[PDB]
Amino acid sequence: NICTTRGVSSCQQCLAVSPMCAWCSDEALPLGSPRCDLKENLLKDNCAPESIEFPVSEARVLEDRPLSDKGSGDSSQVTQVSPQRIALRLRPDDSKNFSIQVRQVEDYPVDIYYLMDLSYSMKDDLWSIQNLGTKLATQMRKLTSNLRIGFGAFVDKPVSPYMYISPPEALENPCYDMKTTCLPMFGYKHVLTLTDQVTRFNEEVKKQSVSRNRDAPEGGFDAIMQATVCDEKIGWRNDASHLLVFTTDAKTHIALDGRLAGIVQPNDGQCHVGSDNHYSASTTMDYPSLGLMTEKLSQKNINLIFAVTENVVNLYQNYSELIPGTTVGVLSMDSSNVLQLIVDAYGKIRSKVELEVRDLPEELSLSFNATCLNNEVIPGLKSCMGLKIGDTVSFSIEAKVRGCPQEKEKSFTIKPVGFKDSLIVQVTFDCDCACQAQAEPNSHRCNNGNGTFECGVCRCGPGW
Amino acid sequence: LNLDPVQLTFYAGPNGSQFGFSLDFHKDSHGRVAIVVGAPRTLGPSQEETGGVFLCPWRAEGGQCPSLLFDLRDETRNVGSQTLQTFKARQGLGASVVSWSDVIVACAPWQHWNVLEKTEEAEKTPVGSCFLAQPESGRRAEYSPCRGNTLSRIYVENDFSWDKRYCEAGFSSVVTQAGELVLGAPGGYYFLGLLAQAPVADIFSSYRPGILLWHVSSQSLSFDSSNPEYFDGYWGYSVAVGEFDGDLNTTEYVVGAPTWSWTLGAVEILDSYYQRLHRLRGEQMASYFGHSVAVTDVNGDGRHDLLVGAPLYMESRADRKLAEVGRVYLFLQPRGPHALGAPSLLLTGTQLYGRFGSAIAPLGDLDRDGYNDIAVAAPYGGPSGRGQVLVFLGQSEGLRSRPSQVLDSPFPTGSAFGFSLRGAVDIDDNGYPDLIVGAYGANQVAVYRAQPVVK
């Protein structure tokens, strides 16, 4: 076989030939017996059972908590990935398989922060937030028993030419030149921290009113960024689905637009909402790029929902595709329901399970066979779709190591996107023999001190 | 390839002036080359930011630069039962500068304007304005083609048609060889964007201080549109000129409109009458395709080629993920009367958020091989994110896909090194065209001298 025809020199080289190779360290080995052969061939030549060096790639679990049935209650001791930790042992060029199970748990906590366009054009859209708190708690109560809701508002960067700056009265009342009155212009203001008191939402909304600015595109993206990176202020929870609902009836400004206001400093992705609950960098820092927004939404694990009117639905459907994980809802006066829209969006959000791999060594490569719907296996697939809340799926995984790495102890993670829980794989590269941990440097047997005696044979010591 | 990166020259301006935000080369009547530099946050008389311009003489050791003085005082004119008002506070004088012949054109895109008539007004808005100077003679002139005397009510009655109150004229600027100034005003016509053109000679001969509203009959502005595809397109965000129709008696304009068609972005090539010859649509929404545009013949066939930057283009990467790196598109001009097809070459950035393609400068023929070359800026690129300029050499087939040289920013983080570029001019008279790179964040300019090729 290949083990013998390779003419190996040491036990280390023997195991590196093939996963099915073994080595014999027996002293009483016949004249010309190849020490590198099959475990069956070695024992056939009266080789001491203990002198057989034949590692085997295994994969035993360490943590195997059971999947939770209800994500309610508990101090976030919910499990939606199993197992949670497994030890993987491989040998050169070998591979081992293992499985993982993911569950879209029922009754999982939900945060909903409502980011509301309050520019003048939103006069005829205010109907949608009227009794929001309550109407937003009703069709949600049947998917979660632990809902929190919060509210924010935005217009645009309060600076010319976006803002009207004459006459002096225009600054305090942007609707001055008309027959009416409205609020001074503002960039973004936090209004209500995430709370379980829905009537707090209702009463806060009832005190909101529109402002007014010059150009159709609005500064909602500034708000999305702050609502994302101002964790403590908004009040996102460590163990809850985060829904950031963005409402508008118009186009949006984007990175590099700020130059029309003399603003060239790039958006820094940091929080700038202070005690006054207003965005203070609004007039000194440019709008955020889709790339930057995506980075933060992913980091803070926020699910952005574009609840927009049908005149711009296409626009935001197109942005939605440049910000993976985003969904769009039509904000009309007719549909499944314009603001159960949020419930349907949630359903769409928890209808996918996509695996993700972090810290995978250069040597290791993984393959996946998904099992969705009803025991339907789908090779070369590490994601699922069309799932309902409560559903469970699994994936068959195979780690194929290439050669033998320098570091024998490495570990990587397999996590579902958006999920808190994850599977930790502790890898161990076994390409050595126990007999190596008991060699004879400068041995009397090997060239009279010029060699090392290990695993039966004589190796050329260090320096030669 | 052969830009000397060891021995640079540095010019520096006042702190917080944004010295280097814009620049250009300038030859006096005697052909002596100097650098003109815009510093749009330089302090004015009332210790308030108004911007300013500097004219830097060539010195191997660089240093400080003398100012190119302009009138920074607000103006008022009570005429025709009306009151005309200019506001230069935070106008951003020097947000762009361009040099033609022995004249220097420095623009203030956010200079504000208003007209009062009893209890009515036009609205205090950023119409922008340009300051023209002839340094040797001391002559001064202005050009503010978006100023108007129509009252607010009138626009409302007319559904805001032909509304030039937010032009921001001078946002971008270019001058044709013939001496026609062309100003991009991305805020024109309620943020559609417009172009304004007029002969420099006529701008000078018709201007007088104090008037504020004067006619330049020979001027020519682009047109308003009812088509929503143009809304908020910022047409004129960047501008260039060149020859794209064969006829050498006509000059064609190249206009960038980075938010055209719902942020798809586009750049258009037009004739002097603003009739569209070609349109190049963006590849990706919000990539800001059209942010910058360059015109140069890179493959030595005598036909001008087009280059377009999209600094926020997001490249597709493993696992269905996008990485904002920026991209440049090369369009080669075909033989005779034909349309520019697909781009001949796509240059994509590497550093995340690097904004590769924010600025694109023709260098002329840097290595003297017979083909023109370009420089591309990534103001926040490089492994350190301090900024980077990449040189790409021309060739018969277009451009090289890999850079021949990479200039790393000598400045600290945040200098915006590369935000402005200018080349194709031999400043030390050594036979090789040189590169000047602005870094407004650091209020400095770096001059790279080209040397004989080593290889």
């Binding site: 003048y120 054009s121 939103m122 005829d124 600015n213 159709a216 609005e218 | 805001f160 309620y190 943020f191």
Partner: peptide, 6 residues
């Protein structure tokens, strides 16, 4: 029409 209007 092109502005912030209902």
């Amino acid at each position: 029409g092109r502005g912030d209007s209902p």
